[PDB]
Design a protein around this ligand. Structure first.
Ligand SMILES: CC(C)(C)c1ccc(CSc2cnn(C(C)(C)C)c(=O)c2Cl)cc1
Ligand code: SF4
Ligand code: SF4
Ligand code: SF4
Ligand code: SF4
Ligand code: SF4
Ligand code: FES
Lengths: 127, 240, 384, 196, 127, 166, 180
């Protein structure tokens, strides 16, 4: 599993994600938008874990309107995932103390935890 | 090495082993107030009492297993009905004068007294007979409350059960005799004329006190022990 | 026609998916699909103190929940040997038979509405409200009531409970006899139920169809007689049975079960003498609320019990009971900790549902609805 | 009655008999003898198969032979042809890296769904099953929930201003291996049982 | 009997006395401990006039020099007790009707209490 | 055309949509029986305009999420929600739907607002039937445009108008 | 058995002319039993001191984990609780609360005790976290009810009636049997 981007850099993370994504077919891939604070999406921050099934991709807490211009990047991101054929969007809610350490856990622990705790999400809430 | 038997089990053990330690080493258990890791044991709480056979020749009176040495091939009984009877009795004596502050006690669930009491107290006396918790219906001991001994340490002299952990520590471990009793009998209470707590190792008694007498003032009234999110790590202020 | 009667549609109670293999208007065979409600009680229960799990017990089989409450209580008690006072046990069996009445009321209302006319859903369900009022009197809750405890019950009955209950015990026999007069001499329900639903007792046994429809196939297999636990040994009891497993005999047996349940309610309430309400052993029961201002030991036991709870011995346990849907039990593995090591539920409707492809095989497409309703499934029980 | 004959049959066969003082009986059969023994058990007249309960003994304080343990429940209906009422359990341990067990589909069709649940909840594959299709958990779910190494997946409870709770670090109740907030657990909180 | 009431009533008076001394000599008086059968009474009735059971007169350093306690609502052998810390000095006051508050047979006058507290101030207090 | 563009006409159609709430039955769990009891012959949700009950999603506007929304039911419900006419409202019934309830685990969506735009939330376990009537009255005055939150904001008549569904 | 159709007609008509049975909520107040599990209340002593001594037992015994208690030390000059400890922050998420009664059963001072109100539906998640000053016994009504009384100018009307309020609810204001 790869880790691209950096914290709190929506544009850098997004452009690196465009480049590294390429023409990957997401017909059976899974997108986990991990965030904190279930309700307040107005100031929410978002991290992304993309499980393709053959290899996985991590982007830390660098998306969301909590960062200046993060919502526009998140909009392009969800539009991109929807274009490539994604159907299954998920949101995992972790404690802020978790989000930061979670990206330092081994791939198996992070991925198992996230796939276990996921909440099915309507992608429309992030567009 | 030396052979010991705990109630059904046989243990090899080096000679200098305390009967209490060998008991725990066999997986058994016994209340514990007087003795502590790395502290000089003295039979004070009289909680560690077990049965000892030294031949089947039971000791005449119960031996203090916290400060009683071991001999090769010695029998130890911690499950005799009389044993649990005596342990519950000692626990009741200890709980006699506590101030009834558990709900507002910042030591909360992590009170050795609470756990040993919920373990060994109230042996099934012999139906659905109405049980009574306490028999002592007199007035309890009341002394000065929540006295900050130092900008770091709070002292509630009521909750003390008069063990020796804090004064024994202060004499042995730092070598700074800045805490000891005042009176004797039941009126005994802790005091000092060295108030600033000069020893730079004062805070550790905060953890040792099996009751909520000595607490960490800087963490007073924040949360209960089980509520706090525990992360073990290492302090990098200095190289040790 | 591999037709997908999808989840929840058309108004298929007990969210369920059915792939009806079917050519025409018959029913070749229905492939069921369940799992649409699996919440993980067997898992979440491993993380709640013994006292707390009583909050997880009723909400699974949300119609006849007191069977859950009592089975879990008995399993834990046997694990630690607690004694339920006779008055507590009697109140428990009263509430058990009462929730049985409410469950059967809801079952037959749902069934009658499922295919045919809507009206009789109300009257029976009406009584449920009255019954619920009764429960609201004692437990303060309509259902999902948290009343039972390991030693016994939470607290005592008010003076106001018995009169309302007698009033209902007076109206219920006439009410049930009215429904039966409506039903037994069935004009169309006869040609709708008597023939349908082939239940060969051999197959009902091989699939373990315990949910009261086995005795419609003529097997007198009830725990209340087979394995007396809560004093049923001390009750004047009719155990209804059916001659041939069909819908009609099923429904008649359930109605006679309701009347006998009312008779059991009368019997239990009549023998009611003052006494205590739960096992006062402090490890097992929290301290009485009045001496919290007298004893240190009181505060210690209250605090520890309501934070940690108690630690039963290392061991595994099971006790069965008879639900409105058949044999129930909890396989409880305790590891000597304050929380159970594992809690597995023998879900009667879960094993009972295996008989759907057989039952509805060759029946009509509309009758696939009644033949489900005749089984009285509760998918909170099945998916679990 | 047939339970007593099971006892007199198995005890001579060297099968240990586990019993607690509550009235429940366990008969431990090894892997091989399991299938033919239980075929005989049905032949002995054991019509009714109540439960197939899967167990993960990983986090049990005392160790056990194997991680997984599957228990079947065999009964004889009292009101049928020859009704004794004998009900008892058969436990069979299953290796962590060899989750094999032949099905009893040939004997009972009831184990059709039940075994599937264990393949859903545990990594146990039941050989000889008609269709091992995931019953309860979503189709795209990866893993087997009830085994202890599978997270429960708790989500914090929320409040007004940044104040939250993570339950697994919040729970005060102790499991078997959690020594507690004091130095240890002894006495009643290492196991307590009243004597009637 | 019911003298308990006046006892508690007289107890209040004692506390009153205490407060006066503190206000005169400019020494901190502190409410040490309240009644448990009043904190832990949930629906239960409470008839006592006050909620306070134990109090003290503390020096600048916080070490008390005069301690006073009264027996609870439900305890046997109801009394009032007095103590001087560090001085092995203990007093058992009762209340006898008609006479008044008594140390044994010696009535307890306000000025007696003042003399004891002044002696304590001069002697025991460190600062 | 969306029920707008005349001060009287929008009041009128909002009035109509408010009292003509046509429920779409989506029973999930034990909330469902206390939902149905809001229609029994002690307490009927059959007066305000909700007597008839179109199980079809093509004919009913209010979707009462009564019970725990298990994840394997989430996407299905998804399309079921999109299989409603656009003038539709979505009430989240029970604790398990509104919040995660006591089932804080891998199996349940911890707030149904994730998949569907929630109009009204109703705590309770189970919510007393009269609380369900109170929730539909809350939704009533919401779709009339007569509803304000704790922060002073007026809420839109129809939630699920503000989401770029796709 | 053709007679049964006629009998069905007959019984349906008999119930037709039996007009009454129903209650038109909110027009008619629902009769609630005195033991009902409702909106939590924080109770006060006669002295005016609040009963909560902030002991976090309600939060520890909460099987849904909806109770958060930030504690603080009583100010002896103006105390709030009866002991040396009080609850600076007591928030309860009604969406998490499953209405057990364990908080009441553990509260040693009888501070947190379930009430009776059920008309608590609101529109926004973050608004359904009821606060201490939104549940104190001093208050009359639920949050949406109070907000409607502000935005409406119309006083609070409770939609329930009970035969009586329990002793454990001392102070709890409710309609009582019709004495008023
Ligand atoms: C028309 C009414 C409102 C009466 C109606 C509304 C909704 C349904 C389908 S939901 C449903 C219904 N009953 N059950 C039981 C527990 C009885 C099996 C369920 O488990 C589920 Cl999930 C049916 C009828
Ligand atoms: S203050 Fe604590 S550590 Fe010191 S003697 Fe008393 S109980 Fe022991
Ligand atoms: S020291 Fe222990 S027994 Fe005393 S109040 Fe605190 S928790 Fe309770
Ligand atoms: S809130 Fe309660 S009644 Fe509703 S679905 Fe959840 S457990 Fe069932
Ligand atoms: S009733 Fe509510 S606040 Fe009280 S213990 Fe239950 S979930 Fe927690
Ligand atoms: S249990 Fe009662 S006294 Fe304790 S914190 Fe909760 S409300 Fe306060
Ligand atoms: S343990 Fe203290 S006396 Fe031995």
């Amino acid at each position: 599993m790869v880790r691209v981007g950096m914290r709190a850099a929506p544009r850098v993370s997004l452009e690196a994600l465009k480049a590294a994504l390429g023409g990957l077919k997401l017909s059976e891939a899974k997108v986990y938008l991990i965030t904190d604070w279930q309700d307040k999406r107005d100031q929410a921050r978002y991290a992304l874990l993309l499980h393709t099934g053959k290899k996985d991709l991590l982007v830390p807490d660098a998306f969301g309107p909590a960062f200046p211009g993060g919502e526009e990047a998140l909009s392009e991101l969800v539009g991109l995932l929807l274009a490539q054929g994604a159907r299954r969007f998920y949101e995992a809610v972790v404690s802020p103390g978790e989000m930061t350490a979670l990206l330092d856990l081994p791939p198996e622990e992070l991925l198992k935890r996230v796939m276990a705790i996921a909440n099915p999400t309507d992608p429309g809430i992030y567009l | 090495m030396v052979r010991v038997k705990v109630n059904d089990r046989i243990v090899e053990v080096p000679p200098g082993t305390s009967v209490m330690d060998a008991v725990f080493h066999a997986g058994y258990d016994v209340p514990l107030f007087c003795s502590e890791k790395h502290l000089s044991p003295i039979g004070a709480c009289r909680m560690c009492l077990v049965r000892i056979g030294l031949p089947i020749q039971w000791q005449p009176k119960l031996a203090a297993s916290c400060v009683t040495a071991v001999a090769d091939g010695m029998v130890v009984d911690t499950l005799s009905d009389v044993v649990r009877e005596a342990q519950a009795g000692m626990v009741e004596f200890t709980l006699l004068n506590h101030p009834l502050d558990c709900p507002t006690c910042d030591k909360g669930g992590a009170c050795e007294l609470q756990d040993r009491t919920v373990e060994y107290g109230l042996y099934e006396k012999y139906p659905l007979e109405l049980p009574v918790y306490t028999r002592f219906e007199f007035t309890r001991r009341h002394v000065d409350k929540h006295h900050p001994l130092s900008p770091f340490v709070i002292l509630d002299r009521e909750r003390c059960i008069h063990c020796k952990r804090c004064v024994r520590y202060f004499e042995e471990v730092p070598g700074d005799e800045v805490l000891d009793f005042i009176e004797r009998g039941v009126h005994t209470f802790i005091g000092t004329m060295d108030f600033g707590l000069p020893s730079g190792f004062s805070g550790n008694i905060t953890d040792i006190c099996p009751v909520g007498a000595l607490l960490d003032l800087t963490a007073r009234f924040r949360a209960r022990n089980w509520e706090m999110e525990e992360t073990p790590t290492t302090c990098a202020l200095c190289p040790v | 026609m591999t037709l997908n009667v999808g989840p929840q549609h058309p108004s298929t109670h007990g969210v369920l998916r059915l792939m009806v293999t079917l050519s025409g208007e018959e029913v070749l065979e229905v492939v069921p699909h369940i799992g649409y409600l699996h919440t993980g009680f067997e898992k979440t229960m491993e993380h709640r103190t013994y006292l707390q799990n009583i909050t997880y017990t009723p909400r699974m089989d949300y119609l006849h929940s007191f069977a859950h409450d009592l089975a879990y209580a008995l399993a834990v008690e046997k694990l630690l040997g607690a004694v339920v006072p006779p008055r507590a046990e009697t109140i428990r069996v009263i509430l058990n038979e009462l929730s049985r009445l409410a469950s059967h009321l809801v079952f037959l209302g749902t069934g009658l509405l499922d295919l045919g006319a809507l009206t009789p859903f109300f009257y029976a369900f009406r009584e449920r409200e009255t019954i619920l009022d009764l429960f609201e009197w004692v437990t303060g809750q309509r259902f999902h009531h948290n009343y039972i405890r390991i030693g016994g019950v939470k607290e005592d009955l008010p003076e106001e409970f018995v009169p309302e209950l007698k009033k209902l015990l007076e109206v219920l026999p006439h009410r049930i006899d009215e429904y039966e007069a409506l039903f037994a001499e069935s004009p169309i329900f006869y040609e709708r139920a008597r023939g349908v639903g082939v239940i060969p007792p051999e197959v009902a046994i091989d699939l373990g169809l315990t949910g009261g429809s086995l005795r419609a196939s003529g097997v007198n297999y009830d725990v209340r007689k087979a394995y007396p636990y809560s004093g049923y040994e001390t009750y004047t009891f009719d155990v209804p049975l059916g001659e041939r497993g069909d819908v009609f005999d099923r429904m008649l047996v359930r109605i006679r079960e309701m009347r006998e349940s009312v008779k059991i309610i009368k019997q239990a309430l009549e023998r009611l003498e003052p006494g205590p309400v739960r096992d006062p052993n402090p490890q097992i029961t929290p301290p009485p609320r009045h001496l919290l201002e007298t004893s240190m030991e009181a505060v210690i036991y209250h605090f520890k019990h309501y934070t940690e709870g108690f630690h039963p011995p290392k061991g595994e346990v099971y006790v069965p009971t008879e639900s409105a849907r058949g044999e129930l039990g909890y396989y409880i593995v305790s590891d000597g900790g304050s929380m159970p090591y594992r809690v597995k539920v023998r879900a009667p409707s879960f094993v009972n549902l295996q008989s759907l492809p057989y039952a509805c095989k060759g029946e009509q497409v509309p009758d696939m609805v009644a033949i489900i309703a005749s089984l009285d499934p509760v998918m909170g029980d099945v998916d679990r | 009655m047939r339970l007593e004959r099971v006892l007199e049959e198995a005890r001579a066969k060297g099968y240990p008999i586990e019993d607690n003082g509550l009235g429940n009986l366990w008969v431990v059969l090894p892997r091989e003898r399991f299938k033919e023994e239980m075929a005989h058990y049905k032949a002995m007249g054991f019509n009714f198969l109540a439960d197939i309960v899967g167990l993960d003994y990983l986090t049990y304080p005392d160790p056990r032979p194997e991680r997984f343990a599957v228990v079947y429940e065999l009964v004889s209906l009292p009101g049928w042809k020859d009704g004794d009422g004998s009900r008892f359990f058969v436990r069979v341990y299953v290796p962590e890296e060899d989750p094999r067990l032949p099905t009893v589909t040939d004997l009972w069709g009831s184990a059709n769904f039940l075994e599937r649940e264990v393949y859903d909840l545990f990594g146990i594959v039941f050989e000889g099953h008609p269709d091992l299709r995931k019953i309860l958990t979503p189709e795209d779910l990866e893993g087997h929930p009830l085994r202890k190494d599978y997270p429960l997946g708790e989500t914090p409870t929320l409040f007004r201003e940044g104040r939250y709770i993570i339950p697994a670090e919040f729970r005060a109740a102790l499991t078997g291996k959690d020594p507690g907030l004091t130095f240890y657990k002894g006495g009643s909180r290492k196991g307590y049982r009243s004597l009637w | 009997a019911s003298s308990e009431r006046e006892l508690y009533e007289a107890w209040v008076e004692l506390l009153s006395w205490m407060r006066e001394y503190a206000q005169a000599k400019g020494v901190r008086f502190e409410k040490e401990a309240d009644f448990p059968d009043f904190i832990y009474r949930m629906e239960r009735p409470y008839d006592l006039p006050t909620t306070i059971m134990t109090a003290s007169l503390s020096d600048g350093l916080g070490e008390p020099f005069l301690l006073a306690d009264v027996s609870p609502r439900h305890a046997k052998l109801k009394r009032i007790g007095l103590r001087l810390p560090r001085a092995h000095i203990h007093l058992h006051a009762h209340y006898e009707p008609g006479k008044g508050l008594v140390t044994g047979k010696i009535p307890l006058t306000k000025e007696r209490f003042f003399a004891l507290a002044d002696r304590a101030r001069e002697a025991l207090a460190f600062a | 055309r969306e029920g707008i563009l005349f001060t009287t006409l929008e009041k009128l159609v909002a009035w109509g949509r408010s009292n003509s709430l046509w429920p779409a039955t989506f029973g999930l769990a034990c909330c469902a029986i206390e939902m149905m009891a809001s229609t029994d012959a002690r307490n009927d949700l059959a007066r305000f305009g909700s007597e008839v009950f179109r199980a079809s999603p093509r004919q009913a506007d209010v979707m009462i999420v009564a019970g725990r929304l298990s994840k394997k039911m989430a996407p299905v419900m998804r399309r079921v929600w999109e299989q409603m006419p656009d003038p539709k409202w979505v009430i989240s019934m029970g604790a398990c739907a509104s919040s995660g309830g006591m089932f804080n685990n891998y199996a349940i969506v911890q707030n149904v607002d994730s998949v569907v735009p929630v109009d009204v939330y109703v705590p309770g376990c189970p919510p007393r039937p009269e609380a369900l009537i109170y929730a539909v009255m809350q939704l009533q005055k919401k779709v009339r445009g007569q509803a304000y939150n704790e922060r002073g904001e007026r809420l839109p008549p129809v939630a699920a108008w503000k989401r770029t569904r796709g | 058995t053709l007679k049964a159709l006629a009998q069905s007609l007959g019984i349906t008509l008999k119930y037709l002319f039996s007009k009454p049975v129903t209650v038109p909520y909110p027009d008619a107040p629902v009769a609630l039993k005195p033991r009902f599990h409702g909106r939590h209340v924080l109770t006060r002593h006669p002295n005016g001191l609040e009963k909560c001594i902030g002991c976090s037992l309600c939060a520890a015994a909460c099987p849904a984990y909806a109770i958060y208690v930030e504690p603080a030390e009583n100010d002896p000059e103006n105390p709030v609780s009866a002991g040396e400890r009080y609850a600076k922050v007591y928030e309860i998420n009604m969406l998490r609360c499953i209405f057990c009664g364990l908080c009441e059963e553990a509260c040693p001072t009888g501070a947190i005790v379930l009430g009776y109100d059920f008309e608590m539906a609101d529109y926004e998640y973050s608004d359904l976290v009821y606060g201490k000053e939104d549940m104190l016994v001093d208050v009359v009504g639920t949050k949406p009810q109070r907000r409607e009384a502000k935005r409406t100018g119309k006083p609070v009307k409770v939609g329930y009636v009970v035969p009586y309020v329990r002793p454990e609810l001392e102070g709890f204001k409710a309609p009582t049997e019709g004495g008023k």
